[PDB]
């Protein structure tokens, strides 16, 4: 928001305003990058990017900790280095290249299309980078009529993407990527969990409208009373949220799951690429931004 606005005080005393991504900016399949560019707290156009600019972002305007990203740079860097075919340093190139294809990029997101979703060709592909809508309403519909949700819904919300996207995926192409998207479901509710309750550190609820906001307008939803966490979470907390949306109990399983989806799973870890391998092709489509209503400056 507007420095001047004061939205974000006293949690955030240095904002800056939404600006929509443009059709030559650079913008990632996450949903916290993109609302960290369109307010400019890394670069608004996605690139040329160090990792201190994005600890900094994350920390100062979004009480997230260093700890909870460590892991996250290494890969960021590992795929910028695999898709551009040299060390990148400490500058990513871009944040459009985090969209490369079983890497971090993985099937079965949240609210994004899969690389061969609904193809009928084998050699075809999809915006698997942008948030879409129709994508996330199968996520939010595991939850609906509700305001707030638990690990085990959670881990229903997963369990439901896993079963469409592998129905829906050009056969072969599905491959399940538990340790990275539980990591992100850890960081859910890391994020907009409902810290007004009396438990929230210990027995986190996601806020669903919260949720919704963020991910549809890639922005932050202090206008439905969200602020930055305080203090900034940490990783142990999105690490045990993690194992804990996985060891919860399912009352409701879909058909057509990949072996395995339903218990614990791996440690998250560095990723890596035989450097004979050639990356797949990124989605070229210009970047999302909501429209169904267009953004201002303080939104
Ligand atoms: C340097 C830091 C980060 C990098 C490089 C990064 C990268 C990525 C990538 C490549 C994806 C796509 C995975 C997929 O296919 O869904 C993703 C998704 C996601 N990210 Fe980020 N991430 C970072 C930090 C964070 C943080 C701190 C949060 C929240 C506190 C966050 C929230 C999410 C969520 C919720 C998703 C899942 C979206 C979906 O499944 O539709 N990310 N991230
Ligand atoms: C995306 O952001 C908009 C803008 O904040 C959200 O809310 C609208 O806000 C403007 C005024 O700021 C008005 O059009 C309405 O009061 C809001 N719309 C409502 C309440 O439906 C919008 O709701 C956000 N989208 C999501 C999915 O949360
Ligand atoms: C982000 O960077 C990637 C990697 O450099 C760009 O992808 C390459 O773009 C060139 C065209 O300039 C193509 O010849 C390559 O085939 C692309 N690589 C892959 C793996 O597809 C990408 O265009 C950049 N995106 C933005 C928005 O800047
Ligand atoms: C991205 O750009 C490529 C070169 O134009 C296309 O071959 C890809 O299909 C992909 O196209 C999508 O995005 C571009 C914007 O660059 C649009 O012009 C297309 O209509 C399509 O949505
Ligand atoms: C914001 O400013 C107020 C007033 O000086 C201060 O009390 C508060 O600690 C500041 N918040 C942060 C996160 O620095
Ligand atoms: C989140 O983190 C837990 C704990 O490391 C893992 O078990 C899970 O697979 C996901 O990576
Ligand atoms: C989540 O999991 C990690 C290991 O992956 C732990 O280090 C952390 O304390 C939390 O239990
Ligand atoms: C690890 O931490 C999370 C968040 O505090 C808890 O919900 C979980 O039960 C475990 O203690
Ligand atoms: C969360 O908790 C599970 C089991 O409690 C662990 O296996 C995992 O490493 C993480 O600490
Ligand atoms: C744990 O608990 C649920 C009920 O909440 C059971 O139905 C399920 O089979 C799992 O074992
Ligand atoms: C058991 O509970 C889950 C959530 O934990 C629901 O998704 C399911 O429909 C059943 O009520
Ligand atoms: C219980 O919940 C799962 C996931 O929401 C569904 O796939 C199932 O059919 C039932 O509605
Ligand atoms: C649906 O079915 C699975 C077995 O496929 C159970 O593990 C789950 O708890 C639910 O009963
Ligand atoms: C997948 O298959 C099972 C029965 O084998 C059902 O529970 C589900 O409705 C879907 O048809
Ligand atoms: C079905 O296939 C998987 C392979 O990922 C195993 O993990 C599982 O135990 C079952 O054999
Ligand atoms: C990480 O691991 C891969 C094997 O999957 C190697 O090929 C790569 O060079 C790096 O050591
Ligand atoms: C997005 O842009 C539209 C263009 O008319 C405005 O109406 C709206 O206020 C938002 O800034
Ligand atoms: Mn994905």
Not at 76 to 89: H, N, R
Request: glycine content about 6%.
């Amino acid at each position: 928001q507007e420095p001047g606005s004061g939205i974000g005080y006293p949690y955030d005393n240095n904002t800056l305003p939404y600006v929509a991504p443009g059709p030559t900016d650079s913008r990632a399949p996450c949903p916290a990058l993109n609302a960290l560019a369109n307010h400019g707290y890394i670069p608004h156009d996605g690139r040329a990017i160090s990792r201190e600019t994005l600890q900094n972002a994350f920390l100062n305007h979004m009480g997230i900790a260093n700890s909870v990203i460590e892991l996250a740079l290494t890969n960021a860097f590992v795929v910028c280095e695999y898709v551009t075919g040299s060390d990148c340093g400490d500058s990513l190139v871009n944040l459009t290249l985090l969209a490369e294809p079983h890497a971090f990029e993985h099937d079965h997101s949240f609210s994004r299309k899969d690389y061969k979703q609904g193809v009928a060709n084998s050699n075809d592909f999809i915006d698997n980078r942008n948030f879409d809508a129709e994508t996330f309403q199968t996520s939010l519909d595991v939850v609906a009529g509700k305001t707030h949700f638990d690990y085990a819904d959670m881990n229903e919300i997963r369990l439901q993407r896993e079963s469409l996207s592998n129905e829906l995926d050009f056969p072969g192409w599905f491959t399940e990527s538990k340790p990275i998207q539980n990591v992100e479901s850890g960081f859910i509710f890391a994020l907009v969990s409902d810290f007004n309750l009396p438990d929230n550190d210990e027995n986190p609820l996601v806020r669903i409208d919260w949720w919704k906001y963020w991910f549809t307008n890639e922005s932050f939803p202090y206008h439905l009373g969200w602020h930055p966490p305080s203090p900034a979470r940490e990783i142990e907390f999105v690490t045990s949220a993690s194992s804990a949306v996985l060891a919860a109990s399912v009352t409701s399983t879909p058909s057509s799951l990949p072996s395995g989806a339903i218990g614990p799973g791996a440690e998250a870890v560095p990723l890596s690429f035989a450097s004979t391998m050639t990356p797949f092709l990124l989605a070229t489509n210009a970047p999302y931004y909501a429209q169904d209503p267009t953004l201002g400056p303080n939104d």
